[PDB]
């Protein structure tokens, strides 16, 4: 990529200028030592007093003062140049930190946000986030560069303070040393990211896993004394108040908190959470209130001087006491993961969303749950729109759907999302390859399937989703069409749809014989 090349070239450029500055600092150190050892001779000659005899006394005193004025010129003539060297060095340091601020903002506020958005979208079966072993190298190099610069600034300040030529150096060194602290604090607080999220909607008293990382921890000696991270859970209100610096030392109780291990090869410092559990929750619609898992730690960098308390918020989660509440709550989660604004307060979401983005997210999670590449075609989306009217997708191109109208009761005990997720479940458990084989209609309705089997020969099939039961399917036949009572999930768990079809009906979905579609799925 062009941006990758740009930022890598910028990284190598920063490394080059930092090595330049290190060379200049070493030269300044050796030069100051030379200046001190040459200065010692000024005191050596300022005592060569003796009181021998008036003639030689006056002659030698005049000669000594004539040498002393030349020494007082030579010195301070070299010292002014030393001060100029130091000022130029401080200017180089300041320019380096300006470039550092630019590059760090580019890394954090642009690329990490992209990775986190990819994570949110993979939450609903989008493209996977991607390995952290590309941002890891960038962050490690950032940390190395800023640490070398802080070290150079510190040693330059100490070496200039032992020979304190006042000048303007003290101001510039109260400054840009003022800026390195902001840079390193932003970095250490912003590289505590969640690698593998804790699962969205999760039931109590069930084990779940989550893994966090410290990106820059590989080089900053925090792995020497590895800090342990603790995981808590807080409702949306406490999560909002926390970012507002409202000190509140809530939500529910976890069962585990653990230390961060280190991979010596990839140089990654990470905390795995493999046996976490939620045993008690303090709730204030149960399937709609969102919680978040906060991970927090505290550690030190270098000596005992630099301490950092760091915290990170995991993506919103919904607690589900009884298992039967699962299917609904996921909707809420998806909605957040579908429409999270960039700079929004924790779990703030726009009540009404456009239809195209809605069917986009629906197709995404559908291709996710079915584990197939069939997805929602244009006619299927048109049918879904007609369920929630005219039969052109261009008509629904500018309509808006509220959350209340999404997950209501369109015409029965359903709610549109619940029916969609029910068909998702029924073909995710028993009808994955049958959906991938092009055998389930998916966009067939009453009197829409009937007109598709009148001009066709006898015995043809069509498997649509039943609009009487939630997770069931209805078939077709051959004068009039012959439906049936819905095939409940149980009716598949006892004899799947592949063997239930095994005699009178021979064709599916015009000409394709029943065997050529289901011969590889009968019980031998």
Residue numbers in the entry: 138 to 185, 189 to 389, 393 to 427, 434 to 537, 541 to 559, 562 to 632, 638 to 661, 664 to 685
Paper text:
Unphosphorylated STATs form an anti-parallel dimer/monomer equilibrium, and upon efficient recruitment to the cognate receptor–kinase complex, are phosphorylated on a specific tyrosine residue, which promotes parallel dimerization by conformational rearrangement. The activated STAT dimer translocates to the nucleus, initiating transcription of target genes and altering chromatin involved in loop formation in enhancer-promoter landscapes. The canonical domains of the STAT family are all present with the coiled-coil domain (CCD, S138-T331), DNA-binding domain (DBD, F332-V470), linker domain (H471-D591), and SH2 domain (Q592-P685). Archetypical STAT-type SH2 domains are comprised of an anti-parallel β-sheet created by three β-strands (conventionally labeled βB-βD) surrounded by three α-helices (αA, αB’, and αB), which are also observed in STAT5B.
In order to gain insight into the structural basis of the N642H mutation, as well as to validate modeling studies on the differences between STAT5A/B, we crystalized human STAT5B. With these domain boundaries, human STAT5B was crystallized and diffracted to 3.29 Å resolution. The overall architecture of human STAT5B is analogous to mouse STAT5A with a rmsd of 1.21 Å, and a rmsd of 1.89 Å and 2.03 Å, in comparison to mouse STAT3 and human STAT1 respectively. Within these domain boundaries, there are 29 amino acid differences between human STAT5B and mouse STAT5A, which are predominantly located within disordered regions and the SH2 domain. Conventional phospho-peptide binding occurs perpendicular to the central β-sheet with the phospho-Tyr accessing the N-terminal (pY) pocket on one face of the β-sheet and the flanking residues occupying the C-terminal (pY + 3) cavity on the opposite face. The pY-binding pocket is positively charged and harbors a number of evolutionarily conserved residues, such as an invariant arginine (R618 on βB5), that form part of the complex phosphate coordination network. The hydrophobic pY + 3 cavity serves as the peptide selectivity pocket and is predominantly formed by the βD strand and αB helix. As such, the surface-exposed βD strand controls access to both the phosphate-coordinating βB5 position and the selectivity residues located deeper in each of the N- and C- terminal pockets. Several of the variations between STAT5A and STAT5B occur within the βD strand and CD loop (Q636, M639, F640, M644), which ostensibly correlates to differences in peptide selectivity between the isoforms. The SH2 domain is a hot-spot for several mutations with the most prevalent mutations occurring either on the βD strand (such as N642H) or in close proximity ( < 5 Å apart), suggesting a common mechanism of action.
